[PDB]
Each structure stands twice: as structure tokens, then as C-alpha cells.
Amino acid sequence: DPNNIKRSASYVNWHPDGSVPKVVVAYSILQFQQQPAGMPLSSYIWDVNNPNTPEYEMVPTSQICCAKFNLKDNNLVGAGQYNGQLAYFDVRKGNGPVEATPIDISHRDPIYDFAWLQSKTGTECMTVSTDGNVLWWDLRKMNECVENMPLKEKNSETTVGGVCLEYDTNAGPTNFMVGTEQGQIFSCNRKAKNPVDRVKYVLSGHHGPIYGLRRNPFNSKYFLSIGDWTARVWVEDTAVKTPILTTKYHPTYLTGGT
Amino acid sequence: DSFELDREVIAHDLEKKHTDLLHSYARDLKDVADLFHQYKPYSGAAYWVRGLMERIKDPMDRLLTSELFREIQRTYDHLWEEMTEYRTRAVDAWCAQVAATSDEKLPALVRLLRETKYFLLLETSSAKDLFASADTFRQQISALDLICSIYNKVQRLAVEKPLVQQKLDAVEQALNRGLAEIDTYIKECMELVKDVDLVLNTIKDNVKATQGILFDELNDAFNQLIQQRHSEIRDAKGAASWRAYVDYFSNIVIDGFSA
Amino acid sequence: NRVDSNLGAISSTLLVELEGFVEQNRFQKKQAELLAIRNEEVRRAIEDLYTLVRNYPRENTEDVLDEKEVSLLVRHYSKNMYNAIMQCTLNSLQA
């Protein structure tokens, strides 16, 4: 629409049921010294049956990014922001925060996430920032940090970023990777059978600020690394800390796919 | 090196294809050179530099494990070399910029704390400045108390005309105003806490306004008298304003009870 | 697609469906918005097409301006193909 002006779309997520062609979209501007003196942002939901003026508009209190949805339902939607302030919205009101996840002590940093855990018969979440402190929040009842562990690298430079984390396509007991932006993919499990230090993998070898991460589906577990302007394919073993099907060194610095 | 089998039988097949590596490194060397000098936070620039630089460091290692190699040595020389010149002058210029913005501080804050974190991350991969960073982060606690204070200024009144006409909050406001132009900040935070208590007094005024907002005629008269008695008890020009609020209550009761 | 998946489905609709006929009135509310909705995008789409043809370097065009009157002819063909839509829909309806 002609309000979708001066506002980069810095995500698009897709609605999860089958024959609902809706898209939830997510519009922002970073490098915030040119934070736009105009529009405070409000994302949207478009439909493909008609290119309708956005069915519902979600108005946040700050710059919406990364706005994932709620899993397999026609009700609810999450979001991210720039403070750290998560958000949460239902479909029968075109308004602001249904349950704004508040400020508490730790997470006061830009969030590129709103990632769901498979907490059955309920809802859940986690975040990631340019401080490190990946900080799980609550389920259904929302206001508390569940397993609020500021994570820490083994040799104590805990400002370890992330983007675009991926879970398990085999039933999902909390094994995941975090797309850490300094050129080193990290990984975790959260069930510390060991002490609380459980960040095994630094897969150093990708280049510069990483922008891609995805497991592969449809048969196996081989994950991807499309982040910098080389588009690899990586593998998860303790002996293969290096690609498998490296593909082309490109022009035009890469930024994202799956 | 899934084979290497050096002979005098392979060799005269692979001079031309070690040459082909030399020309392919030159061709994507010009893709790097095109992308570099065409698209030539703040620290995205140093990441631009050292991304491409350790990127290009790996190929020189790969080749050098001699006729084309001289011209590849030419391009490699200055291109690798001046790009280090840019990273050097970049840290010079933004040492100047952090220094000057720090001086003005005694927006800019979010930029400079993000920048100090980011080349700090780089330089482990001034001291007074980082002390002050820790100070204004532990005072970011009370800078998130300033936002509570400014909210409180926002929602803080025709009902509140009585109390404000009788309140002496301007003395604490004048203490903040003399503060508006070390431990002074900390004691002013406790002054804010006392002022937040006065904000709780303002919202107690709001709550009493809202509860004054809302045969069987004896029951209705008893309910109205109970609401008025609750307002009057919860109260303690002031007598005149109390009478005015009671008259507005009576008018509202006549408006609602005539339906 | 954007200029002829609409205008070959706008001319594919069927307004009146199968006293109680007031439901038809209600029914003919709904699809009304349909055609209106579709029309807006085509009034968008042809419009956007012009911007695409205008904004492009082509160093041998910065001394030859684009003309006008045939762009008004492109616009006019868009209008008349809307009209062909609606007359097809109405005649099929009355049939």
C-alpha cells in the first residue's frame, strides 16, 4: 500500500495453516541515526485472495522486526522490537500489545528473534541480541523469565550475538544453533547434563558477519550457511568442522535465504 | 591434495592449470576489486575491511605453497596494502569521534556505547572512558528511573485542582530544577523515589475520582451516600472544591437516575 | 498476470447466485467489494508499469524525453479493457 514507504521490510513470515494464503510481514529501519523522523512503525497482514488493505495492523511501541507467528493456528502472533520488549497480539483487535512482555533487568538490547520451543499444550519463546544473554520467557502466562541464563563463551567474552536460530526436525528436544554474527556459528543444548556451560560448537570458518542458518529438511540433519557472500552447506559432526558442498564465491555481499 | 604424485609425466600437463589457478584468482580478484571500490553502526566499515582482508589473506597462502605471479604480486601489493591504510585511518578518525562525543556528554549515547562494545570486541580478537561506560550503565538503572519519573509527569486534574492548589510539590520540583541545570545524582534518585510516592498520592486522587464517578429507592440512596462518604473520608478552597465535587456527583446522579 | 489475471477473472464473476431474495441483495454486497478491490490493483498495476518504464539509466535517453500521448493511449486501453470486463459480466448475468 502507499503507506509501505520509507520502511524496509526486514522479515516476511508466512501463516502456518494450509490454505490460508495470508502473509504476516515486518517492516523496519536499522542504522538508527537515520531513525525515521516520520512513521512509528506498524506491520501488517496481507492476503492473496484479494490484495487487501492489511487485514489487521499491529502497532508496536517501537520498531518491529523479526516478527514470527504462533505455531499452526489462525489466532495470535508474536513480534520483536528494538528495546528488547517482546510483544504478543490476537486477531480480534487491530490494536497494540495484548500482553507486552515487560522490561526486567537483563535484556535491554535489540532482538532479531521471537523463536518458539515445542512447549506442548501452550506457547513459549527465546531471544538473542548483541549482548549474548539469550533469555527464555514464559508460557501462556507471560511476564517472567523461565530459564534466564545469560549465556557465556568458554573463555569469557560473553558478548556473542546471533541471528536466525534453527531447531530439530526430529521431535525437538532442545538441540539448536545460534547464528553468531562475528563469523563463528555457535550451538547449544539447554539441558545441562554437564554443568551450566554447554556451548560446544564454535564452527569457525565462515566469513564475516553471518546472515544464514537453517537445518535441512525432508530427510536428514545437514545445516546451511548462506550468510556471507559464499553460500556453503555444512554438516554436524565433530570431525567435519568445514563445509561439504561449498558453492560459489559470489559478488554482492550475501544476506539471506533457506 | 587428494592425490599429491609428482613426476615428469604429470608435470607437463599441470603447468597450464596452475596457470589457470593464477588467472582465476586474478578474475575473482577483480570481482573483489570491483565490489570493493564501487561500494566504498559505524564499525560496519572496519568489518567491511577485515572481512575482505582475511578473505583475501587465504588465497595468497593457497598459491605460494614465475611470470604471471609478478602481475598478481602487483595487484596484491597495493590493493591489500592501501585497504590496511583505510582501516588504520578509520581507527584514527573514530578515536577522534569517540573522544569528542565523550567530551560533549560529561543518538550519541547508543551509537557510542555500541561502538565501544564493537571495536572492543575487535581489539580482543580509554580506561576512564570504560569506567564512565560502566557508570552510566549502572545509572542506566536510574536512567530507567528517569523514564518512570517522566511518565509520572505525563499522567499528572479538575478534581486534582484542589490538591495541587494546596500541595507544595514545587519545592521538590525546584530541587529537581536546580538539578536540571556525583552522589548528587544518587540523592536526586532518592528524591525521585519520594516524588514517586507523591505520584502515588496523585493516583490516589485519581482513584477517588473514579469511585466518585460510579422500595429500592432507600437502597439507591444508601449506595449514593456510601459512595459520597467514601469520597469524603478518603479526602483527608479545599472545602469549596469538595463541595464542587459533591455537586458534580449530585448532577451525575440526577443524570443517571432520571433514565 | 497483474493486468490480465484480474481482468479475465473480473469478467468471470457471477453476481446473482442461486421475499427471501433479499439475501441476493446481501450477496450482491459482497462481490461488489471484490470488483472494487481488483480494480484498484489494476489501477495500481498499469500505473506502476509506467514508473518501471521511466526510471532506468539508459545513457542515450538523457537527451530524449519520453513522450506523453501514447502513454495516455496505454492508459486508455486499460480503461476500455475494464469496460469490456463489466459488459461481459452483466450480459452473462442477464443470460
UniProtKB/Swiss-Prot annotation, chain A:
Keyword flag Cytoplasm: yes
Subcellular location: Cytoplasm, Cytoskeleton, Flagellum axoneme
WD repeat coordinates: 59-99, 106-147, 205-244
Name assigned to this protein: Dynein, 70 kDa intermediate chain, flagellar outer arm
One cellular-component annotation, GO: cytoplasm
UniProt keywords, alphabetically: Cell projection, Cilium, Cytoplasm, Cytoskeleton, Dynein, Flagellum, Microtubule, Motor protein, Repeat, WD repeat
Presence of the UniProt keyword Transcription regulation in the record: no
Principal location listed in the UniProt entry: cytoplasm
Function text: May play a role in regulating dynein heavy chain (DHC) activity. May function in holding IC78 to the DHC, or in stabilizing the entire dynein complex.
GO biological process terms, semicolon-separated: cilium movement involved in cell motility; outer dynein arm assembly
Family classification: Belongs to the dynein intermediate chain family.
Spans traversing the lipid bilayer: none
Subunit record text: Consists of at least 3 heavy chains (alpha, beta and gamma), 2 intermediate chains and 8 light chains.
UniProtKB/Swiss-Prot annotation, chain C:
Job of this protein: Force generating protein of eukaryotic cilia and flagella. Produces force towards the minus ends of microtubules. Dynein has ATPase activity; the force-producing power stroke is thought to occur on release of ADP.
Gene from which the chain derives: ODA2
Cell location: Cell projection, Cilium, Flagellum; Cytoplasm, Cytoskeleton, Flagellum axoneme
Family: Belongs to the dynein heavy chain family.
Free-text comment on this protein's domains from its UniProt entry: Dynein heavy chains probably consist of an N-terminal stem (which binds cargo and interacts with other dynein components), and the head or motor domain. The motor contains six tandemly-linked AAA domains in the head, which form a ring. A stalk-like structure (formed by two of the coiled coil domains) protrudes between AAA 4 and AAA 5 and terminates in a microtubule-binding site. A seventh domain may also contribute to this ring; it is not clear whether the N-terminus or the C-terminus forms this extra domain.
Regions annotated as coiled coil: 22-56
Protein name as annotated: Dynein gamma chain, flagellar outer arm
Subunit description: Consists of at least 3 heavy chains (alpha, beta and gamma), 2 intermediate chains and 8 light chains.
UniProt superkingdom: Eukaryota
Full-length numbering of the shown residues: 775 to 877 of 4485
